């Protein structure tokens, strides 16, 4: 057979798995350049609604022309599409904002989801009971496992829609922290009620074990993130000689912290962060300057392409993964996550503003509550729910899909004009200076003195103890790139000097 | 109850904040007669390790005297009291509050200056940088950083431009969040 | 169940596929730093024998402790481990060397493998017939399909063992070209005799179709490489606005040229090269300078890690993939590939030196013939041979494995002292200058004039026509990054100026 | 057979190379009387497009004469004949061969120079660079490239250092491969 051209034969059975993937990544890239090139579109749309629209458009072309659209799976997601986005977010982390805004970021997440989860659980239980035959029979635990999967704002969508608006650094870091720290209390209210579903009688001791489980899932997650952070810092000590393996000790040492902590069923999304904040101080130092411009400019490309892909995939999995429409339940979950979110935000800001320095202006509260977007961690967690244990997931998917579409479209195309109308401060900190840095550290040392004079042990005092600790015991046994003692003043001066010199040389004429 | 309302007006604290601060005052007095001097502050365990320890200890004091009374600790400490939007926009008559953003930067420029002559200078920047930075780092490198800051900052032309543009380069730095302290009740 | 810690449970069934892979890549990285740190080892061993030794050591620990070592498969190789190495080789291509040394590189490959393949076929047919019962019954075509899989020098091993020695740029480009262009005549003598095995009577017309098949597999391979090269150049024209997708238009536009040309069963290894030499002129220009230091410093890491992995994998697949030892056949294939290689080299250099400018000094001939290493494309092609069509692949693997070990160890640990003893010129061109570049282009233009004066239409005249062509019709419709007209003098000056300025600024003190 | 052995010794070609070159000579003569002049060379289709066309046409000629005979085309062309190792190391008496590496660089320095005064200069480099490069590129940018080359090359101190270090910076450039031509029989 194959008379003409004996060798030439179509082998599309080994290449199809990588060829389809390459085509999808190419579609992501082409759309990303497309809606940047077309003028004025970036204002009207949040540049992330069009990704979902294109996703469902190509899902309606793949379907309807005799091919089942590929339902973005769940674990080609937790492992392959999410780690880039999370490592991007937790690597380029404005650490001073967390260090000062830690109370709110750790109370808008730990007790700001553990509330919305139960709020939706309770009130959607109520609507389900009084709803009708089809909605009924869900029962409490099958509704708590819906509150806990729908009330988990996406570390993806919030950042992908708040990148373009350039909100005040405080408000932006608040949504950062909400989303990044949310998974620590979504993966202990999703693996806990699943085991509180079939566990015939709940008891009360098992709930105490649930609290201890949350402490483990959070603290051990951060601790594993640290342990593969004091090893990607201790391994980039030894790499003076081997210059071409630098862009890799940051990835296979965090993407192996995100898999040795999603293995144990800890929270990977936060262990990856904790391993993206213990590496940067000791991997920005002892590797060269071109390997670092590789790590940075590659993590940016990773995350940009991954966010584009998973938005195209929520688009292409809403044309073949949304069905079983039930009006009472869908409308109820919309209203009862929106009213839940805003009420939780108002309550917790009343609580916090009795403690923080810069009070949360009601503009802040409204852009937090209205700007907490739901994304693919609400879809890929409503897809791991097997149809055999929980016989109502024909409906959970359509509720999740309508909620994703509502908080990505109508809380996405409207968050743009909303900040303009409310006139919130927009990214005053666009550029960087040297006097900024010097005087900032002066004020930091001033407060570190004052707080200990008063006795008010707070953020600055702990920063002091930590910085003295990793200036004595670490940073001499972990960096060893001759930079064991150079303060941040000198390093910042060198960074700025290098940057301005490069820009001057580029401007040849 | 002791006399605390006049302090409460002059400073701007609440009542429990003042009570707790006076508690710390009594704890750190180590003797009624020596309410607060330089020696009392210097023996606080940690600030002496901080590079700016001596500057702060000499910064509370109004003048060359080496006593500080409780009311003064409050006058010099209120400068860190967090700025409150409603209570600053309620009545606008004069810069009565000691935590207005102008004073929160005047405190910094008074920490920089050798004497209260309103003169930041290459000597002052070099001294403070060699304080914050260790002693091992190169000296004319410190000079490079200091003179780079002098050049970029000084629009006066005398290399000083001590305060007016000091504020101008700090406006990009939110000091309301940065240099203020919430004193727990 | 799981009384203590309700959530915490070991889920090693979804992470195992990426976790094992991450562990293997980490092993590659750790060994690579290890035998660079340990002193003086880099001299004694070729730093690529130790990779195979560690591969078989961990294969003897994985085995013997109750676990089947993972046999480096065949298509986790053609698609995932090879494209990085080939794109590295064909991106950082010293193009002037190919343009002048094209005759030899295209005749040490097209008719320098099509000879060794048939030489081994014939003489190993002879030994098989007179060998004994076990060796016998192979038959001609089952031996031509061994000559064609063993006589395909690896674009991997040759470069990975000639990187450290720093041979004369001419000799190094000769081994470059041999290996890169070899696959164009290995994938038409491996898919041709397989179809000449079961094709009952060969005829003679089918051989003519074989020659036309070779022309297609080569020319169409390069043509597909070009077509996805005038598209990764035309797509990096439009990417002025989108700065974070630059490091990607070079990969998914070549790794989609290597899969749209391995699909058709063309030669991917050479289509990837042709798409790595039509992109660099028009993707080094119109993208920024940090995206380029990302592409370059990431391709280097790709290739370094991929070569380390596939050497560790030839190590770990020789402890569980080599068996059925047959002395007469193994010794015969050793002697009859070595004597075949050296004889083919001597013959073809006698042929060539009647045409080339700088004659191939017998030092060159001996380091070519003795330095043509066999690597994983000889193993992963002796593993695609099914045990049902060809009932002698218990033996082909052990012959291939002994040959890989011979040409990677004894032609690997000895090529190091061999060049020292023969005293061959070693990398005179370590550094770079400006006067070099200016006068080089002057001499190039001088010869371009002279050759047309004589009438001797040669390499320079074709370079002239091609350069005028892509200075008029291309480079104005393909670069459009304001660099549509800046000659290589200006670009080289800017590159050198940027480099020296960066180095001066780094040298703060 | 015409007289060709003396050319074969003076140049160093084989016999068929000379025959083929004379064939091209007859084809391009366009008239016996005008064997080779400037006009005959200028009308060759492609070299005139090449930036160095006029330099080459004026480079074959020995002196101000505007005739070239066949023997000279051979004398001026042999300079590109590939250097042959055995036939250059066989007998070492004198630099008889016209393709010795010294002559292969003296040809370049004679192409650079305005007149045969052995003086490369910023004028010469600037002229040749503006020849190779187009006319659109910035002029004092060309000056920057030229003076950078002058500074790095010139160890003489007069900015010229015309030939002796010319060879020194070219030694890193293998000219044996670079600037030689195999003339097909
Ligand atoms: C099974 C898959 C559906 C999954 C779900 C949730 C989690 C998690 O614990 N935390 C997230 N996703 N943020 C991990 C996974 S996994 C181990 O990748 O397969
Ligand atoms: C089937 C696999 C075993 C394979 C073998 C050979 C080739 C090839 O044609 N050229 C190479 N390898 N250089 C391609 C493949 S493939 C399409 O990746 O699966």
Author numbering:
A (entry chain B), C (entry chain A): 85 to 593
B (entry chain D), D (entry chain C): 11 to 195
The authors write:
Sodium/proton exchanger 1 (NHE1) is an electroneutral secondary active transporter present on the plasma membrane of most mammalian cells and plays critical roles in regulating intracellular pH and volume homeostasis. Calcineurin B-homologous protein 1 (CHP1) is an obligate binding partner that promotes NHE1 biosynthetic maturation, cell surface expression and pH-sensitivity. We find that NHE1 assembles as a symmetrical homodimer, with each subunit undergoing an elevator-like conformational change during cation exchange. Each monomer is made up of a dimerization domain (TMs 1−3 and 7−10) and a core domain (TMs 4−6 and 11−13).
To investigate how a pharmacological competitive antagonist blocks NHE1 activity, we included an NHE1 selective inhibitor, cariporide, during protein expression, purification and grid preparation, and also replaced Na+ with non-transportable K+ while maintaining pH at 7.532. The cariporide molecule was resolved only in the 3.5-Å map, and thus this complex model is termed NHE1-CHP1K/cariporide. Three cytoplasmic helices, HC1 (residues 518−538), HC2 (residues 543−562), and HC3 (residues 570−590) were determined in the NHE1-CHP1K/cariporide complex structure. Strikingly, in the context of the NHE1-CHP1K/cariporide complex, distal ends of the two CHP1 subunits move close to each other and towards the membrane plane, as evidenced by observations that the height of the E-helix of the fourth EF hand (E4th helix) of CHP1 relative to the membrane is reduced by 11 Å and that the end-to-end distance between E4th helices becomes 23-Å shorter than that in the NHE1-CHP1Na/6.5 complex. Consequently, both HC1 and CHP1 become nearly parallel to the membrane plane and thus the angle between HC1 and HC2 helices reduces from 88° to 63°. Cariporide bound from the extracellular side to a negatively charged pocket in each NHE1 subunit. This pocket is located in between the dimerization domain and core domain, ~10-Å in depth, and surrounded by a bundle of helices, namely TMs 3, 6, 8, 9, and 12. D267TM6 directly interacts with the positively charged guanidine group of cariporide. This structural observation indicates that the cariporide-bound complex is stabilized in the outward-facing state. Interestingly, the CHP1 molecule favors a well-defined conformation in the outward-facing NHE1-CHP1K/cariporide complex, in sharp contrast with the high heterogeneity of CHP1 conformations observed in the inward-facing state.
